[PDB]
Amino acid sequence: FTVTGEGLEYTWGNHPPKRVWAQESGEGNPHGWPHEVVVYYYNRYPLTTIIGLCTCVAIIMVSCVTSVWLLCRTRNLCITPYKLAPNAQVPILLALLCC
Amino acid sequence: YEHTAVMPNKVGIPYKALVERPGYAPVHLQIQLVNTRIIPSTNLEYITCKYKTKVPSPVVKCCGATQCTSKPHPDYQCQVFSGVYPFMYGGAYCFCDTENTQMSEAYVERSEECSIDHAKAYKVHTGTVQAMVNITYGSVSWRSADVYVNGETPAKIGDAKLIIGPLSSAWSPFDNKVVVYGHEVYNYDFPEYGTGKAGSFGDLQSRTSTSNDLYANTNLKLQRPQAGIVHTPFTQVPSGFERWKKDKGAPLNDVAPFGCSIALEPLRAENCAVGSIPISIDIPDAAFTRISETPTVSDLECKITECTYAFDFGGIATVAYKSSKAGNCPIHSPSGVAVIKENDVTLAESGSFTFHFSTANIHPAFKLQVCTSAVTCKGDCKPPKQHTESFTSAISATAWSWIKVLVGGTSAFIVLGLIATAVVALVLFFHRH
C-alpha cells in the first residue's frame, strides 16, 4: 500500500478499523556535494521534485543558450569597428591586437 | 471585549489566541473542536422487503363448471381448468364425469419478517450544520458547549459569547437520492417511484411502513395441476430484493472522501474536515488587569538547543531573562512557521527557562512574544527524522538557496554585461563623426 502525508486507513475482518499517518521519511541528505543534495531534493516529494528538476534544467539551459546568443551578437558588434582594420592605420591599443 | 479571527477546520488540533486590550495585561484563550456534524434535510419515499405469496383453498365441483372473478388485490390471479378427475385419501375422489372445475387463485402480500429488515429510500436537501466546542481562557478551566454554525446564532459558554460560521465551503458527501439499510447507506441514486422491475430492486414497494397498497409486480404465473391431485402449482421471478442484497456495491462509509464517518440516526456526516471557519468571541471585561501589575520583561535571550521536524514535538530551546518581579504570564508565537507546545510559563527574578515546540522547516525562523515583549529566535538547521505544520515551499535549504542565488546572479551578470557591451560598441561609431 502507498501511504502519504494525508494518511491511510484500513480494516480487517471483524477487527475495528485502524489508521496510519505514515510520513517523515528522509532518504538522502540536504548537505554536502551537489549529487547527494540533489538525490534528497529528489526523493523528498516523489514526483513534484522530479517535475521541478525537469523544469529547472530546462529553464537554466534556455537561459544559458540565450546568454550565449547574446554573447555572439555582442561579439559581432565588437567585430564591427574593425572596419578600420583593412585601412592600414595607427594601432588602437585595445583588447584586440594591432601591429 | 471581543476578538475575531479565522480558524482552520480540524477535529483534533486546538487553537491558541492572545487577545490584546491596550492598558491591560494580555490574555490568551484556547479553543478546540470536538465535532462537525453535517445534517441534511430528508423525507421518506417508501420501504421494501422480501415478499410472500399465499393461496386460499381452491374449489372444485363433481360436475359442471364455474367462472372466477377478479378482485381488487395486489397482483391478483385466478383461472379455471378442465377435466380434473381428482383424488383423495380413500375417498370417492369427488368425481363421476368430466370435472372442469379449478379455482387456483394466487395472492401476494408483505412478509412477516418485513418489520425488521427493510430498505428505505430518501430524498436529501442541504439541512443544517452544528458542532461542539471545548473552551478555556485566562484561568477559567475547560468548558464545553455546542452551537450551530452561522454568522448569526450566539451561544454562551460560561461567561463568553460565541458567533461562528458559516463554513468556508458548501461541500457535502450525499447525493439527491440515497438508500438506507441496516446500519449504513448507499448512493443507489435511482430508486423507482411506482414502477417495479419484476424483481430487480423494486417489486414490493409499500408507500409507508404499514400501508395497504403495493404498486409493483412479480410476474406471477399459474400452472395446470396434473394427475388429479389437489394442489395449486405456480411460478414467479425470485425476489429482486435478495439479488440487490447479494450485490451491494461499496457502502458509502468506505468511500466518503476527506475521511469522515457516517452515523445513522440523524444521518450525521461527522468530522468531515474541510476549509476554515470565521470565529468571533467576546470575553468579559472582569478577566483583564491593569498593565502596571504585571512583571516587566526585559533583557531576553533565546537559545535553540536541539530540534528536528516531525509530526510530534521535536524541538527544544532555552531562554535567559532578567526579570522585574516574580510572576506568571503567557507565551505565544504570532507567526505560523512553528507552533508552541507550551501556553504560559512562570517567571522568577533573572529568569531562565525552556519549552517545547514543533516545526516543519529546516531553518525555523519563528519569532515569539512573551509578557508584552518581543524576541526573535532564529534557531538553526535541524536534522531530518498528524499535527500542525505549514509545508509552504519554505524548505529551501541553505545550500538550495545558495545554488539558486548563484545561478540567478550568474545569468543576470552575463546578460547585463553583454547589454553594456552592445552600447559600448555603438557609442564609438556615434563618436566617429
XYZ file of C-alpha atoms in Angstrom:
532
model
C 0.000 0.000 0.000
C 1.091 3.554 -0.739
C 0.598 5.864 2.228
C 1.110 9.623 2.050
C 1.013 12.705 4.241
C -2.783 12.698 4.420
C -2.634 9.194 5.864
C -4.463 5.978 5.160
C -6.824 3.674 6.983
C -7.904 0.070 6.657
C -9.899 -2.699 8.286
C -9.572 -6.457 8.531
C -12.290 -8.992 9.249
C -14.227 -8.111 12.378
C -11.364 -6.164 13.917
C -12.074 -2.469 14.454
C -10.586 -0.120 11.861
C -7.130 1.385 12.141
C -5.384 4.461 10.736
C -1.738 5.186 9.965
C -0.221 8.574 9.149
C 2.943 7.307 7.521
C 5.442 10.052 6.738
C 8.617 11.875 7.786
C 10.947 9.819 5.578
C 14.346 11.349 4.872
C 16.107 9.205 2.259
C 19.194 11.192 1.241
C 20.641 14.336 2.793
C 20.406 18.069 2.002
C 24.018 18.972 2.856
C 27.293 18.237 1.098
C 28.213 17.852 -2.542
C 25.632 18.593 -5.250
C 24.766 14.996 -6.121
C 23.541 13.804 -2.719
C 21.714 17.076 -2.099
C 20.038 16.546 -5.467
C 19.051 12.995 -4.605
C 17.438 14.262 -1.404
C 15.730 17.119 -3.277
C 14.523 14.240 -5.477
C 13.229 11.590 -3.083
C 11.530 14.137 -0.822
C 8.471 14.730 -2.968
C 8.049 11.590 -5.094
C 7.097 13.378 -8.301
C 6.842 17.144 -7.864
C 10.556 17.083 -7.138
C 11.070 15.306 -10.455
C 8.971 17.783 -12.415
C 10.714 20.622 -10.613
C 14.081 19.206 -11.636
C 12.967 18.899 -15.248
C 11.643 22.457 -15.267
C 14.777 23.794 -13.583
C 17.167 22.124 -16.005
C 15.058 23.352 -18.930
C 14.982 26.944 -17.701
C 18.679 27.064 -16.828
C 19.693 25.638 -20.199
C 17.436 28.049 -22.083
C 18.842 30.934 -20.044
C 22.376 29.808 -20.860
C 21.686 29.466 -24.586
C 20.043 32.898 -24.655
C 23.100 34.295 -22.887
C 25.440 32.709 -25.425
C 23.372 34.034 -28.334
C 23.653 37.489 -26.795
C 27.376 36.806 -26.416
C 27.637 36.057 -30.128
C 25.658 39.148 -31.103
C 27.738 41.397 -28.853
C 30.855 39.773 -30.298
C 29.608 40.655 -33.781
C 29.097 44.238 -32.644
C 32.636 44.267 -31.250
C 33.843 42.977 -34.616
C 32.117 45.824 -36.456
C 34.583 48.681 -35.642
C 37.357 46.664 -37.267
C 36.059 48.103 -40.495
C 39.029 50.418 -39.954
C 41.384 47.433 -39.747
C 41.723 46.929 -43.548
C 42.691 50.604 -43.821
C 46.283 50.011 -42.580
C 46.220 52.746 -39.943
C 47.565 53.612 -36.482
C 47.153 50.962 -33.749
C 44.237 51.465 -31.385
C 45.729 49.782 -28.263
C 42.639 47.850 -27.210
C 41.658 44.344 -26.107
C 42.387 43.080 -29.625
C 45.802 43.053 -31.266
C 47.057 45.602 -33.791
C 50.647 45.801 -35.028
C -14.015 42.957 24.852
C -14.238 40.753 21.760
C -11.854 39.164 19.287
C -12.239 37.826 15.748
C -10.141 35.540 13.560
C -10.330 32.586 11.177
C -9.538 29.037 12.237
C -8.733 26.030 10.037
C -11.232 23.212 10.411
C -9.785 20.106 12.030
C -11.212 17.995 14.808
C -8.121 17.471 16.944
C -5.797 20.454 16.532
C -6.501 23.175 19.116
C -6.318 26.921 18.531
C -4.483 29.376 20.765
C -5.126 33.111 20.562
C -3.707 36.030 22.552
C -6.123 38.947 22.869
C -4.739 42.447 23.399
C -6.595 45.203 25.251
C -4.393 48.305 25.475
C -3.788 49.426 29.020
C -4.109 45.851 30.247
C -2.144 42.652 30.525
C -2.769 40.367 27.537
C -4.883 37.252 27.930
C -4.635 34.092 25.868
C -7.523 31.785 25.032
C -7.609 28.179 23.906
C -10.405 26.733 21.778
C -10.633 23.209 20.407
C -13.195 21.495 18.206
C -14.774 18.188 19.144
C -17.163 17.553 16.250
C -18.555 18.743 12.930
C -21.939 17.120 12.311
C -23.417 17.983 8.931
C -27.125 17.139 8.998
C -29.249 17.046 5.821
C -32.978 17.591 5.365
C -34.680 14.364 4.338
C -38.079 12.824 3.662
C -39.142 9.228 3.124
C -40.302 7.703 -0.154
C -41.134 4.050 0.570
C -39.821 0.827 2.055
C -39.268 -2.618 0.592
C -38.518 -6.156 1.723
C -38.933 -9.780 0.688
C -42.447 -10.717 -0.377
C -44.554 -13.837 0.119
C -47.310 -15.451 -1.933
C -50.328 -17.077 -0.313
C -53.090 -19.136 -1.878
C -56.576 -19.793 -0.492
C -58.024 -23.255 -0.758
C -59.208 -23.913 -4.332
C -62.733 -25.066 -5.120
C -63.835 -27.897 -7.411
C -67.166 -29.476 -8.320
C -68.095 -33.085 -9.008
C -69.849 -31.861 -12.169
C -70.388 -28.723 -14.195
C -68.124 -25.702 -14.141
C -67.857 -22.205 -12.690
C -66.064 -18.979 -13.574
C -63.669 -16.945 -11.470
C -63.865 -13.190 -10.932
C -61.143 -10.574 -10.493
C -60.873 -8.955 -7.070
C -59.010 -5.771 -6.067
C -55.816 -7.319 -4.753
C -52.111 -6.753 -5.428
C -51.324 -8.909 -8.468
C -54.485 -10.955 -8.075
C -54.827 -14.092 -10.175
C -57.497 -16.673 -10.936
C -58.098 -19.239 -13.654
C -60.103 -22.377 -14.403
C -59.064 -25.782 -15.720
C -60.866 -28.718 -17.298
C -61.156 -32.472 -16.868
C -59.775 -32.901 -13.367
C -60.949 -36.296 -12.095
C -59.172 -35.588 -8.790
C -58.189 -37.921 -5.973
C -58.371 -38.040 -2.178
C -57.376 -40.322 0.680
C -59.504 -43.469 0.487
C -62.242 -41.277 -0.944
C -64.627 -41.243 -3.868
C -62.284 -38.618 -5.350
C -65.056 -36.059 -5.898
C -65.720 -37.084 -9.488
C -68.067 -39.108 -11.661
C -67.508 -37.440 -15.056
C -65.600 -34.602 -16.709
C -64.929 -32.240 -13.819
C -63.737 -28.989 -15.423
C -63.577 -27.225 -12.050
C -60.498 -25.484 -10.668
C -60.006 -22.126 -8.947
C -56.258 -21.912 -8.204
C -56.254 -18.252 -7.228
C -52.996 -16.582 -6.214
C -52.291 -13.715 -3.873
C -49.317 -11.504 -2.974
C -48.598 -9.556 0.212
C -45.773 -8.495 2.504
C -43.799 -10.989 4.555
C -43.987 -11.317 8.326
C -40.274 -10.506 8.667
C -40.614 -7.251 6.727
C -40.931 -5.442 10.066
C -37.198 -5.702 10.828
C -35.045 -5.648 7.685
C -36.245 -3.242 5.021
C -34.515 -0.802 2.723
C -35.742 2.781 2.755
C -35.469 5.396 0.035
C -34.926 9.061 0.786
C -34.674 12.465 -0.811
C -31.976 14.760 0.518
C -31.517 18.521 0.796
C -28.940 20.777 2.391
C -30.049 20.913 6.001
C -28.205 22.496 8.903
C -24.696 22.422 10.404
C -23.666 22.224 14.048
C -20.765 21.246 16.284
C -19.476 21.285 19.860
C -16.539 23.177 21.360
C -14.371 22.905 24.473
C -13.091 26.271 25.672
C -10.524 27.661 28.107
C -9.220 31.204 28.568
C -7.291 33.170 31.153
C -7.549 30.993 34.235
C -11.022 29.502 33.714
C -10.970 25.724 33.349
C -12.230 23.577 30.479
C -15.787 24.475 29.495
C -17.754 22.754 26.758
C -20.922 23.566 24.837
C -22.473 23.028 21.422
C -23.527 25.664 18.918
C -24.964 25.995 15.445
C -22.888 27.208 12.516
C -23.966 30.535 11.003
C -22.869 34.101 11.442
C -25.991 34.833 13.464
C -26.682 32.469 16.355
C -24.986 33.313 19.660
C -24.255 30.760 22.341
C -22.884 31.471 25.806
C -20.268 29.231 27.406
C -19.746 30.227 30.994
C -19.439 33.989 30.609
C -18.335 34.302 26.968
C -20.352 34.860 23.804
C -19.797 32.966 20.569
C -20.592 33.621 16.915
C -19.043 31.210 14.405
C -19.656 30.197 10.831
C -20.767 29.979 8.165
C -18.371 27.389 6.769
C -15.850 28.207 4.068
C -17.205 25.546 1.698
C -20.596 24.131 0.747
C -19.357 20.591 0.160
C -21.393 17.543 1.145
C -20.943 13.767 0.820
C -24.556 12.942 -0.127
C -26.495 12.929 -3.385
C -30.096 13.679 -4.271
C -31.285 10.110 -3.656
C -29.907 7.718 -1.051
C -30.974 4.373 0.367
C -30.581 3.265 3.971
C -30.474 -0.345 5.076
C -29.469 -1.990 8.303
C -26.542 0.067 9.501
C -25.211 2.010 6.508
C -26.231 3.891 3.376
C -25.544 3.761 -0.348
C -25.716 6.234 -3.215
C -28.058 3.926 -5.120
C -29.046 7.059 -6.944
C -32.025 5.526 -8.792
C -34.868 4.129 -6.743
C -38.201 3.959 -8.539
C -41.389 5.812 -7.724
C -44.224 3.493 -8.694
C -42.775 1.286 -11.414
C -41.393 -2.055 -10.354
C -38.917 -4.060 -12.353
C -40.124 -7.649 -11.933
C -37.671 -8.305 -9.152
C -34.562 -6.204 -9.628
C -34.781 -3.764 -6.732
C -38.420 -2.752 -6.578
C -41.037 -5.468 -6.614
C -42.865 -4.783 -3.335
C -42.961 -1.038 -2.664
C -45.137 -0.179 0.314
C -45.630 3.585 0.279
C -45.435 3.568 4.085
C -44.412 1.204 6.859
C -47.953 -0.154 7.222
C -49.661 0.926 4.011
C -52.198 -1.291 2.270
C -51.023 -0.909 -1.329
C -48.022 -2.469 -3.081
C -47.697 -0.881 -6.511
C -45.283 -3.333 -8.056
C -45.302 -6.594 -9.985
C -43.728 -10.011 -9.515
C -44.592 -11.596 -12.891
C -46.693 -14.264 -11.198
C -47.937 -17.108 -13.382
C -50.163 -20.116 -12.784
C -49.924 -23.718 -13.957
C -52.275 -26.570 -14.646
C -52.356 -29.246 -11.938
C -51.718 -32.782 -13.123
C -52.564 -36.364 -12.182
C -55.770 -35.344 -10.419
C -54.139 -34.296 -7.145
C -55.447 -31.260 -5.274
C -52.675 -28.660 -5.397
C -52.097 -25.229 -6.924
C -48.868 -25.004 -8.934
C -47.449 -21.661 -9.996
C -44.231 -19.873 -10.893
C -42.728 -16.430 -10.428
C -39.487 -14.475 -10.597
C -37.328 -14.696 -7.455
C -37.353 -11.620 -5.256
C -35.067 -8.893 -6.542
C -34.513 -7.547 -3.049
C -32.411 -10.631 -2.362
C -30.403 -10.054 -5.523
C -29.600 -6.498 -4.518
C -28.710 -7.782 -1.064
C -26.135 -10.085 -2.643
C -24.617 -7.492 -4.988
C -24.482 -4.317 -2.932
C -21.552 -2.199 -4.050
C -19.212 -0.278 -1.827
C -21.033 1.164 1.200
C -20.725 4.918 1.475
C -18.881 4.752 4.785
C -15.920 3.260 2.910
C -15.810 5.733 0.013
C -16.504 9.156 1.530
C -13.602 11.490 0.739
C -11.871 13.701 3.319
C -12.090 10.877 5.836
C -15.429 11.272 7.570
C -17.593 8.525 9.038
C -21.382 8.292 8.871
C -23.669 7.948 11.864
C -27.167 6.598 11.290
C -29.976 8.094 13.358
C -29.828 11.733 12.129
C -27.753 10.791 9.063
C -24.862 12.601 10.692
C -21.811 13.022 8.477
C -19.373 13.680 11.283
C -15.910 15.236 11.321
C -15.778 15.859 7.582
C -12.747 18.120 7.662
C -12.644 20.882 5.048
C -11.997 24.597 4.801
C -11.827 27.214 7.526
C -14.223 28.992 9.879
C -14.659 32.694 10.729
C -14.681 32.942 14.507
C -15.764 35.839 16.717
C -15.697 35.622 20.506
C -16.191 38.100 23.341
C -14.726 37.706 26.826
C -15.975 39.505 29.952
C -14.052 42.595 30.954
C -13.655 41.273 34.502
C -10.809 38.992 33.373
C -8.369 41.756 32.423
C -5.959 43.521 34.743
C -4.034 46.769 34.811
C -0.857 46.812 32.747
C 1.138 48.096 35.726
C 0.591 44.927 37.780
C 2.464 42.560 35.554
C 6.201 41.889 35.810
C 8.024 43.871 33.158
C 10.118 41.668 30.877
C 13.447 42.874 29.521
C 16.932 41.614 28.673
C 15.836 38.499 26.814
C 17.970 35.879 25.119
C 16.606 32.815 23.334
C 18.900 29.906 22.516
C 17.911 26.884 20.446
C 19.200 23.639 21.916
C 18.035 20.936 19.524
C 15.156 20.312 17.148
C 14.037 18.046 14.328
C 10.957 18.323 12.153
C 8.464 15.553 12.858
C 4.758 15.248 13.500
C 5.398 15.274 17.243
C 7.050 17.975 19.326
C 10.675 17.551 18.341
C 12.164 20.916 19.225
C 13.567 22.317 22.474
C 15.056 25.747 23.126
C 16.094 27.785 26.150
C 15.736 31.436 27.112
C 17.726 33.597 29.516
C 15.989 36.572 31.031
C 16.238 39.457 33.502
C 13.065 39.989 35.499
C 11.372 42.856 37.277
C 9.487 40.675 39.768
C 8.255 37.114 40.095
C 5.031 36.118 38.389
C 3.419 34.221 35.534
C 2.496 35.439 32.062
C 1.792 33.598 28.813
C 3.910 32.920 25.751
C 2.816 32.733 22.146
C 4.082 32.668 18.575
C 2.068 35.002 16.334
C 3.857 33.645 13.287
C 2.801 30.299 11.875
C 6.191 28.827 10.968
C 6.294 26.955 14.271
C 3.722 26.043 16.901
C 4.442 26.402 20.612
C 3.652 23.351 22.700
C 3.535 25.421 25.874
C 0.951 28.115 26.608
C 2.027 30.039 29.724
C 5.136 29.935 31.893
C 6.083 31.128 35.345
C 8.877 33.657 35.756
C 11.369 34.180 38.556
C 13.824 37.012 39.040
C 16.637 36.761 36.496
C 14.557 34.313 34.524
C 15.941 31.419 32.519
C 13.750 28.566 31.318
C 12.861 26.383 28.345
C 9.887 24.961 26.481
C 8.937 22.721 23.562
C 7.692 23.216 20.032
C 7.113 21.507 16.708
C 8.044 22.836 13.297
C 8.185 21.948 9.635
C 11.191 23.890 8.301
C 14.876 23.070 8.043
C 15.757 26.524 9.393
C 12.964 27.672 11.708
C 12.810 31.457 11.874
C 9.835 31.898 14.166
C 9.610 34.962 16.389
C 7.726 34.750 19.669
C 6.318 37.323 22.063
C 6.119 36.874 25.831
C 4.621 39.019 28.571
C 4.346 42.133 26.368
C 7.834 41.717 24.923
C 9.158 40.575 21.570
C 12.085 38.271 20.836
C 13.326 36.587 17.678
C 14.813 33.100 17.970
C 16.221 32.409 14.523
C 17.205 28.901 15.505
C 19.420 26.780 13.295
C 19.233 23.859 10.891
C 17.513 20.750 12.190
C 18.273 17.142 11.212
C 15.564 15.147 9.441
C 13.752 12.261 11.031
C -0.852 14.275 12.185
C -0.016 17.672 13.640
C 0.118 21.334 12.744
C 2.712 22.058 10.076
C 2.789 24.534 7.212
C 4.769 22.998 4.326
C 4.583 26.199 2.295
C 7.531 25.721 -0.088
C 9.642 27.082 2.781
C 12.017 24.103 2.816
C 14.638 25.696 0.553
C 17.799 24.833 2.454
C 20.942 26.913 2.827
C 22.684 25.003 0.047
C 19.495 25.173 -2.021
C 19.214 28.947 -1.641
C 22.955 29.288 -2.230
C 22.802 27.466 -5.553
C 19.656 29.265 -6.692
C 21.029 32.728 -5.959
C 24.295 31.722 -7.627
C 22.655 30.682 -10.881
C 20.306 33.667 -10.965
C 23.134 36.100 -10.334
C 25.359 34.497 -12.961
C 22.656 34.696 -15.626
C 21.884 38.307 -14.733
C 25.566 39.273 -14.748
C 26.305 37.771 -18.152
C 23.229 39.244 -19.830
C 23.792 42.714 -18.359
C 27.458 42.685 -19.348
C 26.522 41.818 -22.916
C 23.900 44.576 -22.981
C 26.502 47.072 -21.771
C 28.997 45.934 -24.404
C 26.432 46.498 -27.158
C 26.085 50.212 -26.430
C 29.826 50.392 -25.751
C 30.359 49.334 -29.352
C 27.632 51.683 -30.591
C 28.890 54.868 -28.918
C 32.236 54.625 -30.712
C 30.508 54.881 -34.084
C 28.277 57.602 -32.666
C 31.526 59.450 -31.922
C 33.321 58.782 -35.226
C 31.514 61.692 -36.877
